[PDB]
Amino acid sequence: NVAHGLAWSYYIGYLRLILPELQARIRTYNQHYAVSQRLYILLPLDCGVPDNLSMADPNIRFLDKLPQQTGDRAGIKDRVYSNSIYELLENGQRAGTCVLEYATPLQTLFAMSQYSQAGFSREDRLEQAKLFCRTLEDILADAPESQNNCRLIAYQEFSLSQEVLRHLRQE
Amino acid sequence: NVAHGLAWSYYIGYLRLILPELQARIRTYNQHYAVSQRLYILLPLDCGVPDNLSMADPNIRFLDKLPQQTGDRAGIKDRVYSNSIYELLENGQRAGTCVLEYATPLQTLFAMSQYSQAGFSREDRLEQAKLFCRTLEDILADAPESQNNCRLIAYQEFSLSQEVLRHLRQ
Numbered sequence: 054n055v056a057h058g059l060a061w062s063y064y065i066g067y068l069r070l071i072l073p074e075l076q077a078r079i080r081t082y083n084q085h086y087a088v089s090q091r092l093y094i095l096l097p098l099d100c101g102v103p104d105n106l107s108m109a110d111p112n113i114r115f116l117d118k119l120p121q122q123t124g125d126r127a128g129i130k131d132r133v134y135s136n137s138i139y140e141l142l143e144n145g146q147r148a149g150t151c152v153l154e155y156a157t158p159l160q161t162l163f164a165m166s167q168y169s170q171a172g173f174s175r176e177d178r179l180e181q182a183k184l185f186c187r188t189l190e191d192i193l194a195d196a197p198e199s200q201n202n203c204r205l206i207a208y209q210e211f212s213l214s215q216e217v218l219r220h221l222r223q224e
Numbered sequence: 225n226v227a228h229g230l231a232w233s234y235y236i237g238y239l240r241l242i243l244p245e246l247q248a249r250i251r252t253y254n255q256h257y258a259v260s261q262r263l264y265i266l267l268p269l270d271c272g273v274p275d276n277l278s279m280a281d282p283n284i285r286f287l288d289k290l291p292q293q294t295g296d297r298a299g300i301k302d303r304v305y306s307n308s309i310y311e312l313l314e315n316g317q318r319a320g321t322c323v324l325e326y327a328t329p330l331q332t333l334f335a336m337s338q339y340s341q342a343g344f345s346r347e348d349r350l351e352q353a354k355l356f357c358r359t360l361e362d363i364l365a366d367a368p369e370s371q372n373n374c375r376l377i378a379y380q381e382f383s384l385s386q387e388v389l390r391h392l393r394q
């Protein structure tokens with residue numbers, strides 16, 4: 054079972070650290086340059102994770118980078134954590150701005166697919182994706198750092214933008 | 225068992241992406257500003273991974289940051305990848321300079337030992353450490369990216385400085 058460890062490292066190595074200081078980073082960018090106060094993580098269950106968000110959906114267009122977050126991490130002095138802000142256009146009109154990004158471990162699960170000495174097969178990507186989404190939301194349920202600082206966007210394959218709009222419109 | 229997947233994550237999400245551009249980054253630092261041409265990966269099997277190499281061994285001293293590496297990954301525009309270069313003093317005398325860092329997954333295995341939903345338990349974090357290093361060693365052996373662009377340093381506790389210096393000498 055690979056997805057279990059990837060969900061935990063994703064929380065132990067990233068979410069536990071940037072979420073407590075995310076609200077302050079969004080606040081700092083709003084005063085200098087109306088993004089919502091939440092990190093939205095795309096987790097396609099197909100694990101079709103492209104590197105460019107605009108390449109996946111034309112409606113999803115990059116807006117600007119969040120103020121970097123630094124920190125000494127495992128012998129790396131001032132390791133920079135980067136978060137990208139995106140605006141979502143529907144029918145040529147922007148309807149929401151947010152800090153949007155994919156769940157990178159899913160990209161890793163998709164690539165681990167191809168290799169020979171990977172644990173899981175190439176036909177178990179989907180259940181691994183389903184196992185990652187369940188384990189992450191299980192962790193973020195009992196996680197004291199996730200004080201409604203992020204929301205999980207899980208879907209199966211289409212309009213990605215309006216799935217994103219559905220959640221931000223909720224806020 | 226979790227140590228197998230995080231060795232694959234360490235290789236797929238980091239090493240396979242930075243090792244190919246490692247020597248070009250060391251050469252840039254060297255000409256514009258005597259750093260080694262390999263990335264040194266400390267692998268403490270105790271799993272006691274501190275955030276500051278400073279404090280684990282005073283002789284290991286942080287001097288400068290390697291030139292950044294950026295790239296678009298998983299929807300983050302130009303994601304920053306940071307590497308730190310250290311000086312290692314031997315009896316008050318600098319003996320080597322290299323890009324030195326810990327294996328972050330080992331720090332995560334230690335942290336997960338505490339959490340209940342994590343598969344392994346406290347007693348198991350040591351076996352996972354050696355298991356992570358083994359898996360990473362097998363992956364690098366068949367890794368086209370690993371043109372010996374990095375060296376793994378496994379050590380069970382003491383002078384970390386010496387353990388590092390032994391390898392750099394060779």
Ligand SMILES: Nc1nc2c(ncn2[C@@H]2O[C@@H]3COP(=O)(O)O[C@H]4[C@@H](O)[C@H](n5cnc6c(=O)[nH]c(N)nc65)O[C@@H]4COP(=O)(O)O[C@H]3[C@H]2O)c(=O)[nH]1
Nearest residue numbers: 063066067134135157158233234237238304305306328329
């Ligand atoms: N959006 C975003 N997400 C982040 C960032 N840093 C970590 N994450 C997420 O958290 C996972 C685990 O991070 P890790 O514990 O540092 O475990 C990392 C770490 O050990 C190594 N690594 C990744 N990036 C860097 C880096 O910039 N510097 C160093 N020294 N190591 C890195 O590779 C492992 C796996 O990397 P990933 O596949 O990327 O998997 C990463 C990624 O999904 C970030 O700056 N931005």
